[PDB]
Amino acid sequence: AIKKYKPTTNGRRNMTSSDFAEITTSTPEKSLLQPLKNNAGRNNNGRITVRHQGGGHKRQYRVIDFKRNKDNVAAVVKTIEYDPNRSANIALVHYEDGVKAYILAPKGLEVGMRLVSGPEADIKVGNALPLENIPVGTVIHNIEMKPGKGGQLIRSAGTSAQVLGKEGKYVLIRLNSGEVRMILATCRATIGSVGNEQHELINIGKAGRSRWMRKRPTVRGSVMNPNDHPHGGGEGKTPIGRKAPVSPWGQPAIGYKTRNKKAKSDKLIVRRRT
Amino acid sequence: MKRTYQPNKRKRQKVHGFRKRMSTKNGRRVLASRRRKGRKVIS
Amino acid sequence: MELLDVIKRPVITEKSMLAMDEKKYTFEVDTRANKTLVKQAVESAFDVKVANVNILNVRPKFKRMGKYAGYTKKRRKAIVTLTEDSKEIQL
RNA sequence: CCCAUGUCCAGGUUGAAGGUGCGGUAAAACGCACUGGAGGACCGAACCCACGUACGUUGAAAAGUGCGGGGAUGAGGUGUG
RNA sequence: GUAUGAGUAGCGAAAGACAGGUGAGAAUCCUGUCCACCGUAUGACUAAGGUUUCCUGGGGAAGGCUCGUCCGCCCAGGGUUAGUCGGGACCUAAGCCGAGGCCGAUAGGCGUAGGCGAUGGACAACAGGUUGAUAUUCCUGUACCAGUUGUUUUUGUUUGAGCAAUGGAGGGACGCAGUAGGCUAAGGAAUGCAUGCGAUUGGAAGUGCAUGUCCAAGCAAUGAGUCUUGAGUAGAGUUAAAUGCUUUACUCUUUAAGGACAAGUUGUGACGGGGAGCGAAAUAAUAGUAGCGAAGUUCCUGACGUCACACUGCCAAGAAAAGCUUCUAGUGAGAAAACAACUGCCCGUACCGUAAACCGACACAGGUAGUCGAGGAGAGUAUCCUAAGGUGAGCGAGCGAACUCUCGUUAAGGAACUCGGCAAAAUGACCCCGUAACUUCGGGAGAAGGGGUGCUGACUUCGGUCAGCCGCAGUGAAUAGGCCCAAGCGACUGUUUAUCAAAAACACAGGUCUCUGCAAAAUCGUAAGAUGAAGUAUAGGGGCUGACGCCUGCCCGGUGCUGGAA
RNA sequence: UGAAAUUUUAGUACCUGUGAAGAUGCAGGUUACCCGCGACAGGACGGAAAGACCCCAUGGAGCUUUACUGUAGUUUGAUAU
Ligand SMILES: [K+]
Ligand SMILES: [K+]
Ligand SMILES: [K+]
Ligand SMILES: [K+]
Ligand SMILES: [K+]
Ligand SMILES: [Mg+2]
Ligand SMILES: [Mg+2]
Ligand SMILES: [Mg+2]
Ligand SMILES: [Mg+2]
Ligand SMILES: [Mg+2]
Ligand SMILES: [Mg+2]
Ligand SMILES: [Mg+2]
Ligand SMILES: [Mg+2]
Ligand SMILES: [Mg+2]
Ligand SMILES: [Mg+2]
Ligand SMILES: [Mg+2]
Ligand SMILES: [Mg+2]
Ligand SMILES: [Mg+2]
Ligand SMILES: [Mg+2]
Ligand SMILES: [Mg+2]
Ligand SMILES: [Mg+2]
Ligand SMILES: [Mg+2]
Ligand SMILES: [Mg+2]
Ligand SMILES: [Mg+2]
Ligand SMILES: [Mg+2]
Ligand SMILES: [Mg+2]
Ligand SMILES: [Mg+2]
Ligand SMILES: [Mg+2]
Ligand SMILES: [Mg+2]
Ligand SMILES: [Mg+2]
Ligand SMILES: [Mg+2]
Ligand SMILES: [Mg+2]
Ligand SMILES: [Mg+2]
Ligand SMILES: [Mg+2]
Ligand SMILES: [Mg+2]
Ligand SMILES: [Mg+2]
Ligand SMILES: [Mg+2]
Ligand SMILES: [Mg+2]
Ligand SMILES: [Mg+2]
Ligand SMILES: [Mg+2]
């Protein structure tokens, strides 16, 4: 659920957070861990390529089976766990052959619940089926785009796709963001929503807590100098003395679309919202 | 009042060293200019 | 290198004489040398059975004569401690 | 500014959630105590910073000293690479 | 090059005085006695950096802001000893290089394998002495790690003991805060104990004065205690195998038992060494130096040092790799222990190190990582005075003018000064009482405002309390808030023009709009390639606003954008 | 013991006036033995600095844009692969 801290201090005033009711352990598995270098927006060349990042708490990477290659071998849930690299929670599963693994803990999942994959699999949460073998109307998550690449699309919190039809070799899929799309039918997906629908509600209350979340400060270009941003400069406080407010480069900020108009997937996209 | 030269043998030789200069191409020019000049301290 | 060019000379000093009176002798050595080579060298040069060998390498000592300044050469000084039931090297 | 790896923050204080018990209830909201020990919380050394003032202003100093000053478990200070 | 200013400013924060000595010459050097300064340091370790500044013996040409017989200066000599300390012959992070390869006017850029690379991980020693200068290094004892040869005792010889992988597994292996608790440094130096001595200034041979009031590493045993349920069937899998590892069901046990882990304690080590002090000639012992050597208890306090990230809680969810253990695959006729002996490389090791040796042009009032850092009073590393120990500031003497600076008092008044209460003054610790408007019910609040505080006896059930005494005054000194009323700005903690602006400026949580379906969008770059992301619309990027509350009206004609289409 | 800035030479008075228009130095008149010490700071249009205000230069640099001319990118099409 959500915690609502009392207002002892002006930082803690209107803060909220999660009580982490759905988590059974703070004790992850020593095998599925890998390290993370925080890049802080820097790149191969050391230059800032993505602003407003870096400087927070250390993290590890938790190897997750988005692919679900393993078929006709069940897997029983033991624990739900915090993953800092994402918004959602995760879950530990032992395959009966003894393989340990993490997966993306869907909504309505509980310890002891048992999961499978393949066409013979059943229409229940946590089970990874190809879009061939999934009926219309069902909510899914952990969708992939190319077979064997692994789940790409529906992996974050409180997200929910929905099958809506087919066209032969493809499947028609509504996504979060309202976009309808044709997706290759042999792509695997898992049933249900993704997990903690309450993460959207968390107020943060502290700049320092944003820092812990690795988010540097955003500086506005209406205050920078003219060399620094196209909105910079001006005596006193300046409006946007331009048409089409812009990025630090010449890209407009509002309205200008950025999808390549040569995109091969435009034939697949049926109805887009964004 | 802290100052600009906080010495360090390691940083000095890792930046301004023979290995570094001879590794880069444009350090080959520097060293060869110490010699044409006729330096006793090539690095 | 060769065992006799390993060793160069002894070090006649007060400390070294005080060590001679405790049965361990100082020797200047090739700067590229090794402790086991000093051992082999003395054992072949005196038929004395060596017990232990210490080594120092001395920095070059600044000097000057008029306008011109420079450095004394580097040195390596071994200290060869002998056994009992052994001879005492005569210098 | 950032990456990794380490390290430092005397002492004292206040007393959030949660929990327990006793009331009260048809049972609860609720209340009273105790526990607990949170905080970009408080006072204040080192540490960090530089608000004012005087002095210095061919300075002890190519930006300081003194008298006070602000922060001081964090968005902290600092070291090495 | 030499004048001018001018023999002027300055001689760089602070306490020295005296007697003797050395010497041509003494405020300045040496010895000594008093005195003062530091003491969470102005002390003792030590990384970096410096790189010979260290020690001895001479010197006073220059340097030292004076002098100088002296020095971190000059001259001649010497000085740094490691199987165990730190680093390499061990491991790897960030980052770097990079076979081949990819990309590219050239040059080259990127990057895989594989390497490098500590600030981390792993890794076998410590007590004393000793030099003029080195000390876990040298010396004496006592060990420990890896290895070699030999002797002795065992057992394996190919249905084969043992070694055993780069292969499989485990382990290594980790955050922040918060208290309890145990143990031990440490301290009181309270107590006893040992040694020495009765003070001439009025008193004291006693509950007088002073000083001290120990010892490893290793071996053995023990252990405050702390973690962890563990055994067994049917199995599936562990790129092939496996007695090892993982796990699905199933039974029994779970205050338990078993298995690990442990600070520390005791006995040895130790018939040794240290140690108050006493104290040798033949004297460069021109001694306090060889040398000799007592006792080393009890009680109280008591550590975030350690057990130990052990436990609890929390969210921001907290390196890896190798050593190490096991498994077999493989290999295999030699291996295990006891004893004796032997071997163990390379670099650093001096000295400075909150500084006159580093960085600042200087022997510069600046800055310089970490460890130890005692006592009384005290919560305390604050503060005052002291301990161990270390210093006495590299110009002085006198006279005690104006004026400048740093300080201290002040009649009466009390902000009349002033741009302005600037500066200074006043308050300041602890205990108790008491404490408003307003409020996001948390606060405001240490509000305000008051009172008390010393000493000596009784008294408690240990803090209150009573009585008495003294002073102008009792946190008697030092160290510690001035407060209140109201208004504007910004909500807040924070950041900001290194060197004239600390702010109402920036950020901030929050809000909104917009883009983006994943080879994203955006960005760096010729491109490869990379960030974004080892993320995936509750995610990310960009613009604006800026906590919270009530709100956020009308305008799409214009300029843009989006979509459309004859 | 031992500098520095500055410095055309200097035996370097005052009033009034003159004068590149505000004189230690020219004039007329007046006052004033020579040399110093400590203090002050009215002047030497004092020192420091080729005015930063202003104007000029067919000077420069940064910045803006519905100034000009271009261009990297973005996009559309033709053609080749
Ligand atoms: K290290
Ligand atoms: K103290
Ligand atoms: K319009
Ligand atoms: K004047
Ligand atoms: K211009
Ligand atoms: Mg601005
Ligand atoms: Mg612009
Ligand atoms: Mg305006
Ligand atoms: Mg503008
Ligand atoms: Mg050595
Ligand atoms: Mg605070
Ligand atoms: Mg404070
Ligand atoms: Mg510091
Ligand atoms: Mg300022
Ligand atoms: Mg003068
Ligand atoms: Mg001085
Ligand atoms: Mg102090
Ligand atoms: Mg000396
Ligand atoms: Mg002199
Ligand atoms: Mg000398
Ligand atoms: Mg490269
Ligand atoms: Mg690598
Ligand atoms: Mg008497
Ligand atoms: Mg030393
Ligand atoms: Mg001095
Ligand atoms: Mg008065
Ligand atoms: Mg007035
Ligand atoms: Mg004031
Ligand atoms: Mg007081
Ligand atoms: Mg007004
Ligand atoms: Mg503010
Ligand atoms: Mg502030
Ligand atoms: Mg400033
Ligand atoms: Mg704003
Ligand atoms: Mg004029
Ligand atoms: Mg005139
Ligand atoms: Mg004339
Ligand atoms: Mg004079
Ligand atoms: Mg002038
Ligand atoms: Mg000019």
Short mmCIF file of C-alpha atoms (C1' of nucleotides) in Angstrom, two decimals, chain A residues 3 7 10 13-14 26 30-31 35 37 39 41-44 47 49-53 57-62 78 82 84 86 94-98 100 149 152-153 155-159 176-177 179 181 197 199-200 203-205 207 209 212 217-218 220-222 229 231 244 246 249 251 253-260 264 274, chain E residues 94-96 109-111 169-173 175 235-237 246-249 314-321 440-443 491-493 505-510 513-525 528-548 559-563:
data_model
loop_
_atom_site.label_atom_id
_atom_site.label_comp_id
_atom_site.label_asym_id
_atom_site.label_seq_id
_atom_site.Cartn_x
_atom_site.Cartn_y
_atom_site.Cartn_z
CA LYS A 3 2.38 5.26 3.45
CA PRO A 7 4.48 16.37 8.69
CA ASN A 10 8.89 20.82 5.91
CA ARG A 13 5.52 17.53 5.06
CA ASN A 14 3.62 16.14 2.05
CA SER A 26 15.11 -7.76 1.28
CA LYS A 30 23.51 -14.14 -5.14
CA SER A 31 23.60 -15.75 -8.61
CA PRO A 35 26.97 -4.90 -11.43
CA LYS A 37 28.20 1.42 -13.65
CA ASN A 39 26.87 6.43 -16.58
CA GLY A 41 24.44 10.55 -19.07
CA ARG A 42 28.06 10.38 -20.16
CA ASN A 43 29.03 8.23 -23.12
CA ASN A 44 31.96 6.52 -24.84
CA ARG A 47 30.48 13.96 -22.88
CA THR A 49 24.59 13.01 -23.97
CA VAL A 50 21.50 12.89 -21.72
CA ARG A 51 21.13 15.74 -19.29
CA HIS A 52 19.80 15.67 -15.75
CA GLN A 53 21.08 12.22 -14.75
CA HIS A 57 22.46 5.44 -4.81
CA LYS A 58 24.40 2.41 -5.92
CA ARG A 59 22.48 -0.42 -7.57
CA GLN A 60 22.96 -3.93 -8.88
CA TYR A 61 21.42 -5.41 -12.01
CA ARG A 62 19.07 -8.34 -11.53
CA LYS A 78 8.85 -18.07 -3.66
CA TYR A 82 12.34 -4.86 -4.87
CA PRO A 84 15.65 -0.43 -8.08
CA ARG A 86 12.66 -0.20 -12.58
CA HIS A 94 12.55 -22.07 -9.15
CA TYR A 95 12.16 -24.24 -12.19
CA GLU A 96 11.73 -27.84 -11.13
CA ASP A 97 15.00 -28.65 -12.92
CA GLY A 98 16.63 -26.39 -10.31
CA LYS A 100 16.73 -20.12 -10.36
CA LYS A 149 14.83 -11.13 -28.38
CA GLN A 152 10.34 -5.35 -24.86
CA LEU A 153 7.11 -3.45 -24.44
CA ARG A 155 7.40 -4.20 -18.45
CA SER A 156 6.70 -1.24 -16.11
CA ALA A 157 4.22 -0.72 -13.34
CA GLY A 158 0.46 -0.68 -13.66
CA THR A 159 0.67 -1.23 -17.41
CA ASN A 176 -0.62 1.50 -22.93
CA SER A 177 -0.49 4.96 -24.58
CA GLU A 179 -1.72 2.91 -29.58
CA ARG A 181 -0.41 -1.95 -33.51
CA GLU A 197 -0.30 0.28 -9.71
CA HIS A 199 3.89 3.80 -7.88
CA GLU A 200 2.37 6.62 -9.93
CA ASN A 203 4.93 12.03 -3.90
CA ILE A 204 8.60 12.45 -3.13
CA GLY A 205 8.86 15.56 -1.00
CA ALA A 207 14.96 17.09 -3.82
CA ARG A 209 15.02 11.91 -2.71
CA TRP A 212 18.63 9.24 -4.50
CA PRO A 217 18.29 19.22 -11.31
CA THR A 218 16.51 20.59 -14.36
CA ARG A 220 15.20 26.24 -17.28
CA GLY A 221 16.34 27.99 -20.43
CA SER A 222 14.34 31.11 -19.67
CA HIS A 229 19.76 28.15 -24.67
CA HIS A 231 15.33 31.18 -24.55
CA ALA A 244 7.55 27.43 -31.10
CA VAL A 246 12.51 24.93 -28.26
CA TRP A 249 19.02 22.91 -29.82
CA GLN A 251 14.01 21.40 -31.88
CA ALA A 253 9.36 21.60 -27.51
CA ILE A 254 5.61 21.48 -28.13
CA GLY A 255 3.80 19.89 -31.05
CA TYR A 256 6.72 19.06 -33.30
CA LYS A 257 6.66 15.34 -34.00
CA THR A 258 9.88 13.35 -33.94
CA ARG A 259 9.00 9.94 -35.37
CA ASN A 260 10.89 9.31 -38.58
CA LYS A 264 9.17 0.74 -41.69
CA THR A 274 1.45 9.25 -29.39
"C1'" A E 94 36.35 2.96 -12.56
"C1'" G E 95 39.50 3.93 -16.50
"C1'" C E 96 43.23 2.60 -20.26
"C1'" G E 109 38.22 6.78 -34.12
"C1'" C E 110 35.76 2.66 -31.83
"C1'" G E 111 35.91 -2.00 -29.86
"C1'" A E 169 29.13 -25.56 -7.61
"C1'" G E 170 29.72 -22.96 -2.88
"C1'" G E 171 32.31 -19.09 -0.69
"C1'" G E 172 34.56 -14.53 -1.01
"C1'" A E 173 30.39 -10.79 -0.99
"C1'" G E 175 24.14 -0.33 2.43
"C1'" G E 235 12.91 -37.39 -8.90
"C1'" A E 236 14.59 -33.60 -12.72
"C1'" G E 237 18.98 -30.59 -13.99
"C1'" U E 246 20.75 -26.25 -7.14
"C1'" U E 247 15.92 -27.19 -6.51
"C1'" U E 248 9.74 -29.67 -7.04
"C1'" A E 249 6.72 -32.73 -4.26
"C1'" C E 314 14.30 1.55 7.03
"C1'" C E 315 14.46 2.47 1.82
"C1'" A E 316 17.48 5.23 -1.54
"C1'" A E 317 17.80 -1.72 -1.91
"C1'" G E 318 23.76 -1.27 -1.00
"C1'" A E 319 31.44 -3.78 -6.39
"C1'" A E 320 33.38 -7.64 -8.77
"C1'" A E 321 37.51 -11.32 -9.51
"C1'" U E 440 -0.41 22.50 7.24
"C1'" C E 441 -2.31 20.35 14.62
"C1'" G E 442 3.64 18.78 13.38
"C1'" G E 443 4.74 23.37 15.35
"C1'" A E 491 7.16 27.95 0.71
"C1'" C E 492 11.11 24.93 3.09
"C1'" U E 493 16.89 22.24 3.91
"C1'" A E 505 18.12 35.16 -8.28
"C1'" C E 506 18.99 29.09 -9.35
"C1'" A E 507 17.21 24.41 -7.80
"C1'" C E 508 13.45 21.94 -5.14
"C1'" A E 509 9.21 18.37 -4.27
"C1'" G E 510 4.44 19.31 -6.80
"C1'" C E 513 1.73 20.76 -21.80
"C1'" U E 514 4.27 18.39 -25.66
"C1'" C E 515 7.16 14.33 -28.06
"C1'" U E 516 8.45 9.31 -28.13
"C1'" G E 517 5.93 1.65 -29.64
"C1'" C E 518 11.89 0.44 -29.11
"C1'" A E 519 17.39 -0.48 -33.95
"C1'" A E 520 12.82 4.32 -29.55
"C1'" A E 521 12.56 10.03 -29.18
"C1'" A E 522 16.73 13.40 -27.75
"C1'" U E 523 22.15 13.93 -27.77
"C1'" C E 524 27.89 13.21 -28.74
"C1'" G E 525 30.27 11.82 -33.31
"C1'" A E 528 31.15 2.98 -36.82
"C1'" G E 529 29.95 3.15 -31.86
"C1'" A E 530 27.88 4.97 -27.39
"C1'" U E 531 24.57 7.31 -23.71
"C1'" G E 532 19.28 7.02 -23.12
"C1'" A E 533 19.06 1.35 -20.95
"C1'" A E 534 21.20 -3.82 -19.79
"C1'" G E 535 15.30 1.01 -19.28
"C1'" U E 536 10.14 0.33 -22.26
"C1'" A E 537 4.41 5.10 -21.77
"C1'" U E 538 2.98 4.45 -13.63
"C1'" A E 539 9.57 4.79 -18.66
"C1'" G E 540 12.39 8.50 -20.89
"C1'" G E 541 13.35 13.45 -23.24
"C1'" G E 542 12.01 18.81 -23.84
"C1'" G E 543 9.30 23.63 -22.50
"C1'" C E 544 6.88 26.47 -18.62
"C1'" U E 545 5.35 27.11 -13.57
"C1'" G E 546 7.18 26.21 -8.74
"C1'" A E 547 5.36 23.43 -1.36
"C1'" C E 548 0.13 23.64 0.59
"C1'" U E 559 2.48 33.78 -35.97
"C1'" G E 560 3.72 28.81 -35.21
"C1'" C E 561 2.45 23.53 -34.66
"C1'" U E 562 -0.83 19.12 -35.77
"C1'" G E 563 -3.98 16.84 -39.18
#
